[PDB]
């Protein structure tokens, strides 16, 4: 249990931060990042009942003043929550602009974002709305090639869904320098959708694949055609043969054939 001084002072500051719209944030709210236990103190302020302004500004403050794990805990326990809450409880099911700019302020630390925002989002009922919106977030923000490659390699190992393919498509449209292992995870992902005739198939083998999977396959085959071996290229041209698109299939095949192995 906490001191009653902390209780009353941060319930008072928690009544302040409900209506705060401009000027300077409270003095007791800017000394919380410097605390060894900022998370027992940040709860008394009542995180879900801040105004969108305080969401944006506390995102700035705590993602710019805490460490990577602390920025991750913050973006996971408060920002992701408020994000999903404002998308779910609103009536056109839209997101406020301050919560948004806050997500854009949580993607300045891509490790904290991906591990704390994107990954616990996609694995807890990520519908098409939250991923149209978070997909817009990631599509707008510049992220380091290493954290982008690692987030890509995480989204590739994820169960197939149209939002996750939106995300993989978006990180492949970045066209950065991926390590050969990330490109490996890409080829394995786009491989797992072919039909093995020898008696070993899942659901990804015969399922209906959207426009986004063929676009992501097209961008992958466009940027990383020189960074795949001959074997992986044959597996991918095989996936083109079986699971190819009417217009995109031939161009993915052409983008795999016009490449030099490593």
């Amino acid at each position: 249990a906490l001191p009653e001084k902390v209780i009353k002072a941060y319930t008072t500051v928690g009544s302040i931060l409900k209506t705060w719209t401009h000027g300077k944030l409270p003095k007791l709210f800017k000394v919380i990042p410097s605390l060894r236990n900022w998370q027992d103190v940040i709860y008394v302020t009542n995180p879900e009942e801040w105004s969108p302004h305080v969401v944006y500004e506390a995102t700035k403050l705590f993602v710019s003043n805490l460490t990577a794990k602390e920025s991750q805990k913050f973006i996971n326990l408060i920002l992701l929550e408020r994000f999903r809450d404002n998308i779910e409880t609103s009536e056109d099911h839209s997101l406020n602009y301050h919560i948004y700019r806050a997500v854009k302020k949580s993607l300045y630390k891509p490790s904290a974002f991906f591990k704390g925002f994107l990954f616990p989002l996609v694995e807890t009922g990520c519908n098409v709305r939250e991923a149209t919106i978070a997909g817009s977030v990631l599509a707008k923000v510049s992220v380091p090639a290493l954290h982008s490659s690692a987030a890509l390699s995480y989204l590739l190992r994820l169960p197939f869904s149209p939002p996750t393919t939106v995300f993989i498509k978006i990180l492949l449209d970045k066209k950065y320098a991926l390590p050969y292992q990330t490109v490996d995870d890409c080829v394995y992902y786009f491989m797992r959708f072919r039909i093995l005739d020898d008696g070993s198939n899942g659901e990804d083998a015969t399922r209906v694949l959207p426009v986004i999977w063929h676009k992501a396959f097209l961008t992958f085959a466009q940027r990383y055609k020189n960074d795949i071996t001959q074997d992986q290229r044959d597996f991918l041209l095989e996936t083109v043969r079986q699971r190819g698109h009417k217009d995109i299939g031939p161009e993915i095949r052409r983008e795999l054939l016009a490449g030099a192995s490593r």
């Binding site: 409880t89 609103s90 009536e91 056109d92």
Partner: protein
């Protein structure tokens, strides 16, 4: 606003339900309000 259809207008702010009259008339049967007389 009406917690169903993005409408500032029509709001039945009574009893804390906050559905506009159009949507509340539809959701009336699922809430418990039925046609007697």
């Amino acid at each position: 606003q009406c917690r169903v259809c993005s409408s500032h207008t029509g709001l039945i702010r009574k009893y804390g339900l906050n559905i506009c009259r159009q949507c509340f008339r539809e959701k009336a049967n699922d809430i418990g309000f039925n046609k007697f007389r």
